Amino acid sequence: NVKAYELRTLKKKELLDKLDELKKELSGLRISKALGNSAKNSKIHGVRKNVARVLTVYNQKRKMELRQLYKNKKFKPYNLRKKLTKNKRLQLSPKQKAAMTLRQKKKVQNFPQRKYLVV
Amino acid sequence: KFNKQKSSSRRKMRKAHFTAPAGLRRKIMSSKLSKELRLKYKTRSLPVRKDDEVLICRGHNHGREGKVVKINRKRYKIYVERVTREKVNGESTFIGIHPSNVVLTKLKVDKNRKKILDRKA
Amino acid sequence: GKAGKGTGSFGKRNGKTHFLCLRCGKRSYHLQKKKCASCGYPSAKKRRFNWSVKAKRRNTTGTGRCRYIKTLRRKLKNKFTEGSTPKPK
Amino acid sequence: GSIKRFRLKQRLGKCRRQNRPVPHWYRLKNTKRRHWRRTKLGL
RNA sequence: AGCACAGUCUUAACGAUGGAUGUCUUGGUUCCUACAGCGAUGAAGGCCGCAGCAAAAUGCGAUACGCAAUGAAAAUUGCAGUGACUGAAUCAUCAGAAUGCUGAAUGUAAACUACACCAAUUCCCUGGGAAUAGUGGUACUCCUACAGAAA
RNA sequence: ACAUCUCCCUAGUGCAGAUCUUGGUGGAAGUAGCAACUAUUCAAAUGAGAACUUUGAAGACUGAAGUGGAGAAGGGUUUCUUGUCAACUGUGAUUGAACAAGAGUUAGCCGCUCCUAAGGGAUAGCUGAAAAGUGUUUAAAGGGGUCCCCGUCUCAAAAGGGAA
RNA sequence: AUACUGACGUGCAAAUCGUUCAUUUCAAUCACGUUUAGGGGCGAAAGACUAAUCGAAAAGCCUAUUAGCUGGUUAUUUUCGA
RNA sequence: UCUUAACCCACUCGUCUUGAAACACGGACCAAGGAGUCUAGCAAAUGUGCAAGUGUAUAUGAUUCUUUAAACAUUUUACGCA
RNA sequence: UGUAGGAGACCGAUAGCAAACAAGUACCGUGAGGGAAAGAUGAAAUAGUACUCAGGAAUGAGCAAUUAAAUAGUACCUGAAA
RNA sequence: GAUGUUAGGAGGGCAAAUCCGCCGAAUUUAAGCAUAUAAUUAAGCGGAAGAAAAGAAAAUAACUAUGAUUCCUUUAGUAACG
């Protein structure tokens, strides 16, 4: 059975070749299961999961390569882009929300809320 | 108790005991440790492993010592070699023992268990 | 009339006028007027009303899978960990 | 009737598939069964 | 080996019959504290699937009752497989995955797995070689920007 | 698991009855009853057991507006083979449309699928707080030719029309 | 569906069965598709019909509507008592 | 104690009703559930505390912070009623 | 109201959320909709009724046999009344 | 003002306890009933938030005056309406 860390080393051509080989064996197992004559059927669980593990690693690596390709500036794919509440996505920035008028800023500069004690 | 966040209701505590995850069950498969070993490590209690050696202190089989056969974490039974019982048809299985009915002598010590023993010390 | 009221009536009751409804699923799609009675369809709005409490509750959110609401729970506490992983060994 | 479309066909095969009794290998570690004349599907 | 009228009624003993009472209780209940929106980045709802042996709930989505990662961490068994001197077997966490068909549902549709049109498209290998009719895009209203048309 | 009469607070606190509510159960009673549609018999086989399963021999009936063939609606594995007898099959029962296990429906040419009708839903508009009511009714929207010419859309017949 | 006010009337049946009778090439019958929905429809008109439901359907809610009227209204002893 | 006897007495209970043993009504039988309550505002009575006052309201305070969701206190001169 | 807690001089399976359970399910209604019944063996079934005899087969019985206990035998606690 | 599958974007829908907008009744009460009442409530169609809404004087007073909003205690069952 496969080990995730070992799979991450592999070349994409080779990793897909391994996956296809596993698929052919799994297909053979399904044919044996269907035939039903002295089946080794319990092996199917292991193989389906090995294929699953292979697919996750390939998809993670491919996704990371696409992410590296779209590393900088605007216009990353929106599937790839941040998932957070629609309301948060819609609103003006906290940065902008915090920012305020020149007359107000001068007022702020005029009246700081100092700390104090009583004699 | 003096903490007012954690419940002291009977109902919830029972529910937690019955619907326990496997790690929680493993925690409450603890046994008291044998008296010289207890003195040696200053450790009251250890979680049993499958290959350990217990002495039975309760039930009709009290005062029998022996190696632990199998643990059933789920329904809270350990099985010990010399508490065999024949079934209704005469076939032999092991009597299940609650983990608080036994005192642990020889612990099998792996790397992880050794690290836990180091934590206790 | 032998094919008259009661027993004579029930005998002629072939031919369904309601079917499943793709959106609603409750068998509430009236075929002839092309309209689902409860939960609407083909209306964009979901047709419902407040007089039956029973009807309101037995089609509540949490009747089904809640694929994304369920996923969002736990995620809300975690939040700060966005886009990340526990660090390598 | 004889005539049908894919959704009805699939559902009827599903209902047939469902109806079969509980397996006895599970049991050694209830049932709702439909009889066609007595209880109609109501589709 | 004899003796008992039968039935009806009543009584006691001993039972059938029935599920009351009592005893429980991983449930309700109300109040109080606390946080508190999801959605075209495609929700809720609904279907259709998915277990080696698998029907119904639960769980999950063609990678389908677990994947990766972490923390626990040696068992797991109904049968049968599997694993251990620590990224496997078991749990919990779960921040990275995936994410069926739909459904506002948005290509035109709808007791349809019906039907358009425009892009042909995907993968491997470091600038080249292989695959597949497959995969996308195309709703309505609006806004900011641009375009060549008009008066 | 149980009490408190030592004292006292608190209550969803005392049943024969409501044609009470809910659940069980009698007497009525081995009784009412198992009354449409001409008739079954003999011998055998099966099986623990046969008036009502199977086979054969007789006798008969339905009498082509059929208990016959095909089909629609509707039902939905009821089909079919192999088992089979707990319940059901208002009598019996080895029977079975019951129950368990499997198997079974293959289309260029047969239908749907295409077209329009009686019709339905929308666009353009316009009304209506909105919900909705309408449907060319103050249109700068779809198709064909080589800049011109046509010109609301869409669903609606499994017995109309229709390619084999 | 005229009559036998036949059989039935704890049904075979919430209108059946028998016998009788009327209708049969047209103001014909039947299907399928279609239209109009509750003080609303539809009515060769009977207050008919509108899913066993009709001189105002069915569903849910306002609602635990209201009632000089009906029924019921639970342990004991003792006292005064209409 | 139970059990027949025999003598004497003994009319279906509940019910509304002038009058029920009624030819008045409800009751086949048994079990369990099943009906003058709670809040608001008012009154008299009685208990209880204080008195020309009374009631700490809202609220603040604390070595109050398993119990404590009440108990305690009223600034190192509001309001009801009289 | 949703989720997460902590609670209780609350209810204790005909009660209490319709729902202690494979319940907003079964089932019923053309449909809008309506909407249940339904908990308890034992300490341990990794103690679940072995074996024998008579039985076509159900089953019964045992000088046989589990358990402390089977008139505890899985529609299993206690087991009232009719 | 058109046209654009032009480039970047948005709205749509669901859920509803508390919140806000419209639209908007009757049972009921008066021992009847028509005004009043129920009630600016129930249903209906819409919009939001973790709270919203309201909010910085076209305010109250007639005092020795106060001085955005909300909320509690209160005025007060009072002025008043019928």
Side-chain angles (χ1 to χ4, degrees):
Chain A
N1 292 342
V2 303
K3 308 296 175 182
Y5 63 100
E6 188 176 295
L7 297 174
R8 288 176 177 113
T9 306
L10 308 180
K11 198 71 174 76
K12 300 196 283 81
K13 168 173 170 279
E14 299 302 299
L15 188 60
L16 295 172
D17 190 65
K18 184 60 175 182
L19 177 61
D20 193 57
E21 205 58 48
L22 291 167
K23 285 170 167 288
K24 299 166 202 177
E25 183 169 55
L26 184 56
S27 306
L29 295 173
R30 293 288 189 173
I31 299 169
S32 299
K33 184 189 196 291
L35 184 64
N37 297 333
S38 302
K40 299 183 179 180
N41 50 290
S42 301
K43 185 173 174 179
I44 293 171
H45 181 81
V47 182
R48 178 159 65 102
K49 301 294 170 182
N50 286 311
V51 164
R53 297 177 215 282
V54 174
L55 280 162
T56 292
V57 175
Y58 178 75
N59 293 339
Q60 291 286 65
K61 174 160 166 49
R62 277 266 294 194
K63 186 175 69 213
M64 182 55 174
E65 288 182 48
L66 268 64
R67 196 155 196 140
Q68 290 293 294
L69 179 62
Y70 305 124
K71 179 63 188 184
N72 293 306
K73 82 166 289 186
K74 297 175 297 190
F75 315 115
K76 295 178 191 283
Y78 281 108
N79 327 115
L80 198 68
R81 198 68 199 141
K82 305 291 190 180
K83 189 79 175 194
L84 64 172
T85 175
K86 185 58 175 297
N87 303 285
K88 198 59 58 184
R89 289 185 274 148
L90 186 64
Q91 65 164 102
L92 85 174
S93 187
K95 310 176 214 292
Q96 295 173 309
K97 191 176 182 181
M100 50 71 185
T101 60
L102 184 55
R103 59 222 63 94
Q104 184 173 344
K105 182 180 179 180
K106 290 171 172 177
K107 191 63 166 289
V108 170
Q109 292 316 102
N110 177 259
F111 68 10
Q113 301 296 292
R114 301 182 64 173
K115 283 189 185 182
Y116 49 82
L117 228 291
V118 183
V119 185
Chain B
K1 176 202 190 77
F2 202 65
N3 182 278
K4 194 157 169 170
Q5 305 174 293
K6 300 175 297 191
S7 186
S8 296
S9 189
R10 161 175 286 217
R11 179 178 180 178
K12 301 180 185 177
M13 196 68 77
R14 276 185 166 182
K15 188 172 186 176
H17 182 58
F18 283 118
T19 202
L24 279 296
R25 300 192 198 248
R26 177 178 174 269
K27 173 69 78 57
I28 62 176
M29 299 312 279
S30 191
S31 297
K32 199 170 201 172
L33 183 62
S34 191
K35 313 206 188 197
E36 68 181 72
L37 302 174
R38 176 185 175 198
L39 292 166
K40 179 178 180 178
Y41 293 119
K42 194 64 188 182
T43 296
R44 181 191 295 283
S45 54
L46 194 65
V48 300
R49 290 203 197 285
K50 182 268 274 68
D51 295 283
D52 294 342
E53 186 193 73
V54 298
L55 167 63
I56 305 172
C57 301
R58 287 264 64 82
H60 195 86
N61 300 293
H62 66 274
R64 291 189 179 184
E65 60 183 294
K67 192 182 176 182
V68 181
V69 184
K70 181 63 169 66
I71 300 174
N72 186 310
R73 299 180 290 156
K74 303 80 156 184
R75 295 192 66 233
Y76 312 129
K77 288 176 172 179
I78 64 169
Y79 296 110
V80 175
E81 207 285 299
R82 292 288 83 234
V83 294
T84 190
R85 167 168 178 72
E86 293 65 57
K87 291 159 57 67
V88 66
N89 63 353
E91 297 306 301
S92 56
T93 61
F94 300 105
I95 304 172
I97 318 178
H98 311 112
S100 31
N101 294 3
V102 304
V103 65
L104 170 57
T105 305
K106 302 173 185 57
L107 62 167
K108 175 178 173 179
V109 187
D110 51 282
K111 175 181 177 178
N112 314 290
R113 213 179 199 181
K114 182 55 170 60
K115 183 61 176 180
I116 299 168
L117 184 64
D118 294 344
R119 187 179 72 216
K120 296 307 202 181
Chain C
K2 303 297 172 178
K5 219 172 195 182
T7 289
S9 182
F10 301 126
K12 191 167 179 277
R13 302 193 188 187
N14 63 283
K16 60 185 78 82
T17 52
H18 298 94
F19 207 59
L20 303 175
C21 192
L22 299 173
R23 191 165 82 184
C24 182
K26 194 165 76 71
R27 206 209 193 181
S28 319
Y29 186 65
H30 181 46
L31 292 164
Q32 180 179 97
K33 304 181 202 78
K34 290 179 172 281
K35 55 161 288 186
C36 181
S38 188
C39 305
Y41 197 67
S43 59
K45 193 74 192 176
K46 184 183 180 183
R47 193 77 202 108
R48 50 174 286 189
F49 31 73
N50 296 306
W51 26 266
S52 180
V53 191
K54 304 78 144 293
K56 178 182 180 295
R57 64 176 177 259
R58 75 165 75 90
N59 285 109
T60 196
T61 303
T63 306
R65 292 261 65 229
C66 301
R67 299 186 172 276
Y68 180 52
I69 312 180
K70 185 175 188 290
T71 301
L72 183 63
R73 302 312 199 86
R74 297 288 180 99
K75 206 85 177 181
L76 181 59
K77 169 178 64 69
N78 299 328
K79 187 178 178 180
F80 314 101
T81 55
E82 188 275 298
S84 202
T85 45
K87 306 193 303 194
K89 295 170 290 190
Chain D
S2 53
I3 307 309
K4 58 186 72 66
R5 302 285 71 197
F6 191 69
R7 293 136 224 79
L8 191 66
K9 175 75 169 287
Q10 192 65 39
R11 189 160 292 161
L12 269 43
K14 188 167 189 159
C15 298
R16 193 197 69 178
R17 189 202 310 162
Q18 290 171 315
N19 206 24
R20 290 193 66 181
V22 62
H24 40 71
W25 58 264
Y26 184 77
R27 182 181 174 195
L28 296 171
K29 175 56 183 289
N30 56 2
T31 315
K32 295 293 178 294
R33 184 184 180 283
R34 103 88 175 213
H35 177 73
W36 59 277
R37 206 170 190 218
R38 287 289 166 91
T39 177
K40 296 274 169 156
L41 296 174
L43 301 176

